[PDB]
């Protein structure tokens with residue numbers, strides 16, 4: 174019993190973290206096979222960062238300008254190219270600790286673990302969701318850029334996120350491992366305002382199921398609702414719409430608990446309308462939205 | 478910027494997790510050098526668990542009854558002894574992945590990462606506090622026993638916790654790595670009631686400092702208080718007393734923020750007396766007590 178905000182074990186990713194230095198800028202790189210992936214803004218002075226021209230900045234750069242360090246051993250860079258907003262540094266050594274891996278572009282509301290690193294060294298791991306506005310609410314100081322977000326399926330690391338920016342509002346933006354930004358963000362120190370930070374409705378319902386499974390049931394009410402009725406209320410409260418796809422995804426939790434998805438929706442509706450009245454659910458005083466249905470099943474079934 | 482419930486990177490501990498099987502019971506063991514540490518209740522049938530006599534159960538056991546598996550390779554057990562509530566299985570192979578390590582018995586209110594495992598395989602990592610009543614609020618299903626709690630100081634893993642029991646109230650009890658229970662608990666399926674689950678006051682204040690550092694300041698008030706006055710209020714609200722030692726420990730956060738510890742105490746007092754009035758602090762609707770002063774400094778300074 175018990176439900177925790179649980180990150181994937183980080184060992185397989187720890188083994189891929191290196192230090193990349195271009196001139197006076199040091200940040201983190203991901204070493205997979207004989208390629209080190211890092212944010213292209215490694216080539217910028219924070220002066221550059223106001224209106225950087227990456228193609229022009231890169232003309233001045235050679236393989237030997239990219240200093241790549243894995244522990245206390247230097248990697249020889251034998252090529253470099255820019256793909257979108259990441260640099261791919263070809264090194265002469267395949268990472269011997271390369272796990273089975275994929276690059277995946279996640280959807281908003283999907284969850285992943287971040288291994289926060291500084292100078293190619295892991296400092297901690299935490300579990301995130303991609304917000305519906307394609308930001309994440311991370312913990313990232315200067316030097317953390319190139320820290321990555323991942324999921325693990327048994328022995329396969331799916332890399333979904335590389336950290337690039339802190340918006341002026343202290344929320345975080347980055348790319349998939351093809352270097353394409355999540356959301357409308359760019360690697361420039363400019364006016365970038367995130368959209369509405371809405372709640373991931375399907376995740377809240379998953380977590381309400383997790384609560385019922387773990388014995389927290391005070392919020393279960395006598396009511397049901399419809400998708401349209403529930404969605405009217407969701408909208409008022411800056412909750413993302415619930416689709417039939419979300420209902421289908423919650424099916425197994427519905428099955429396990431014997432609480433129909435629309436009944437759990439009616440319970441959530443009353444929590445929105447009436448608040449918690451000072452009570453807690455799984456030790457939280459607000460409605461948690463950083464567990465997917467998949468996460469709740471995984472943790473409630475003990476997948477390794 | 479940003480503040481997250483961050484676990485230590487788990488790789489060094491992942492490399493120490495094995496599967497221990499005695500008869501039909503499988504749980505997790507910790508392989509350090511040529512010793513595998515596991516809960517002694519591995520020798521019990523859940524029948525035994527009502528009033529087990531470990532010394533008598535162990536007489537019937539031989540080295541070859543303890544099946545130890547590290548990945549898909551079997552370890553040869555060449556000795557076994559009971560130390561308090563843990564078994565030490567001597568194997569013929571030193572774990573080649575043994576990190577530098579210590580065994581430490583933590584105090585209540587201290588924080589640590591748990592690597593939740595099943596059949597010697599990591600499933601996730603989360604950050605805990607030892608509650609003042611010496612329970613932890615974990616996420617542990619059957620097969621998770623022998624999962625461990627640790628801190629990392631640069632390259633040295635300090636192991637502080639091994640998971641043994643779920644109390645009938647769904648909270649968790651375990652031992653240090655010398656096999657001595659935290660709190661008054663025993664490895665028996667009996668009436669064991671935890672004491673008052675109080676809040677770790679010093680940790681709340683640390684986390685209020687973390688909030689100020691990260692821009693959440695709405696709760697800062699115009700008031701100060703005294704230790705005695707604050708402690709009267711703490712007591713009423715099931716908060717542990719604040720000592721001069723706690724004030725001294727908060728000194729660096731006091732210094733960094735320019736908010737005297739007793740002023741932050743007056744802010745906490747008003748939060749206790751008046752509640753959050755529906756507001757949040759670092760995305761929480763309650764007062765978080767699972768960050769130590771050390772944790773706040775570590776994460777706010779980016780230690781690896």
Ligand SMILES: C[C@@H]1[C@@H](O)CCCN1Cc1ccccc1
Nearest residue numbers: 305306368369370371411412413
């Ligand atoms: C624009 C936002 C954004 O966060 C992501 C995409 C959808 N959202 C729409 C939305 C707005 C207000 C209430 C509910 C839903």
Ligand SMILES: C[C@@H]1[C@@H](O)CCCN1Cc1ccccc1
Nearest residue numbers: 609610672673674675715716717
């Ligand atoms: C007995 C508890 C226990 O949780 C740990 C040790 C100290 N506590 C005392 C306490 C009780 C009530 C309010 C405040 C403090």
